[PDB]
Amino acid sequence: ESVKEFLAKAKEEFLKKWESPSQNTAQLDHFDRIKTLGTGSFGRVMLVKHKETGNHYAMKILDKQKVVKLKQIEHTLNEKRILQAVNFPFLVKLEFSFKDNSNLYMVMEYVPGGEMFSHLRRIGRFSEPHARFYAAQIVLTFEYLHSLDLIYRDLKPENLLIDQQGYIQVTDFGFAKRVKGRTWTLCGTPEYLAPEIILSKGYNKAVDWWALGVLIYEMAAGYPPFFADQPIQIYEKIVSGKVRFPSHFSSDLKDLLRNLLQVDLTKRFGNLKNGVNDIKNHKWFATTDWIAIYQRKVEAPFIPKFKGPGDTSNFDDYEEEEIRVSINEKCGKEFTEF
Numbered sequence: 001e002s003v004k005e006f007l008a009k010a011k012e013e014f015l016k017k018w019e020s021p022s023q024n025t026a027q028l029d030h031f032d033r034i035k036t037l038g039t040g041s042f043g044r045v046m047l048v049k050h051k052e053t054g055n056h057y058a059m060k061i062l063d064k065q066k067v068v069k070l071k072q073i074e075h076t077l078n079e080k081r082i083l084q085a086v087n088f089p090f091l092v093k094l095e096f097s098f099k100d101n102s103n104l105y106m107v108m109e110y111v112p113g114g115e116m117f118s119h120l121r122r123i124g125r126f127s128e129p130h131a132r133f134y135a136a137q138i139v140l141t142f143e144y145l146h147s148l149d150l151i152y153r154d155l156k157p158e159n160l161l162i163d164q165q166g167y168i169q170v171t172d173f174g175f176a177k178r179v180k181g182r183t184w185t186l187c188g189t190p191e192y193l194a195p196e197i198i199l200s201k202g203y204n205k206a207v208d209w210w211a212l213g214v215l216i217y218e219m220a221a222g223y224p225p226f227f228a229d230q231p232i233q234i235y236e237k238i239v240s241g242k243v244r245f246p247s248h249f250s251s252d253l254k255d256l257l258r259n260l261l262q263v264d265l266t267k268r269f270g271n272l273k274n275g276v277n278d279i280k281n282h283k284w285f286a287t288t289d290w291i292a293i294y295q296r297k298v299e300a301p302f303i304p305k306f307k308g309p310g311d312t313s314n315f316d317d318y319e320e321e322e323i324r325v326s327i328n329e330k331c332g333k334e335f336t337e338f
């Protein structure tokens with residue numbers, strides 16, 4: 001009942017913000033630009049500093065015209081409407097949002113420890129306890145998101161940032177969506193796609209549990225289970241229902257992964273009658289104190305090395321490009337609700 005009542009309150013609080021979203025809570029000239037932390041085909045993330053408070057933030061900047069051309073309008077509206085409404089210990093917080101003639105802006109907390117991906121590739125693979133610590137945080141995060149009827153749809157090591165306490169904070173809600181029932185969009189990264197996405201089915205929150213299987217495998221092995229050189233080869237392996245496990249995997253880990261990486265979505269852990277509890281009660285998680293993880297009372301496997309809230313050393317280097325704001329409003333109609 002304690003969990004039920006927690007989730008009931010979580011949904012109440014989400015819905016109030018979902019139904020009345022915040023808008024236009026800062027502007028660009030309140031910030032100084034420091035460094036580009038990441039780039040893509042329609043946006044980028046920049047470390048910025050608020051000129052009055054001195055706080056650092058990660059500012060996600062989306063080019064409206066490019067969002068339209070790449071057919072990401074609904075996805076970007078989803079991302080902002082969801083982020084301004086959620087609240088959970090393992091989600092990067094949205095602090096401000098606004099738009100101008102050219103761009104959409106989401107000003108996020110800055111997590112200086114960098115992406116799990118970097119740390120995983122540095123060390124090779126995580127031990128099972130280390131992978132389990134991160135996996136538990138994803139399980140709780142998905143329990144939270146799914147209870148709000150949200151599907152995340154972009155789990156991968158690059159989207160898991162490591163904070164100053166060594167805990168995960170999930171970033172990038174660009175594919176997140178509120179879904180009662182099924183949804184159909186092809187999105188995600190190839191190695192993490194569930195079979196039902198590849199096969200163009202109407203799919204549901206079970207795709208997130210599949211992706212958790214992929215993530216746990218990759219953390220514990222150092223490479224993902226369906227690895228191949230070309231996407232088509234990855235997709236063939238994903239749909240085949242065959243996975244090979246390293247001999248160093250424990251039997252408990254292999255058993256959990258067979259049930260998360262279940263091609264038949266109606267048999268996949270997280271999507272059965274007992275929901276998330278089939279995962280939380282699995283023997284691989286027997287040492288996990290779920291409440292202590294939620295309360296951040298467990299000592300983390302490692303604390304990322306960084307010098308302060310302005311340190312960018314754990315992120316990589318990109319060409320520094322202008323943030324140009326047109327003299328004329330672009331795509332105003334499409335982004336009215338942002």
Ligand SMILES: O=C(O)c1ccc(C(F)(F)F)cc1
Nearest residue numbers: 037038045058108109110111
């Ligand atoms: O919130 C942050 O601290 C942050 C978010 C996103 C990114 C990245 F560029 F990789 F997408 C970096 C940092």
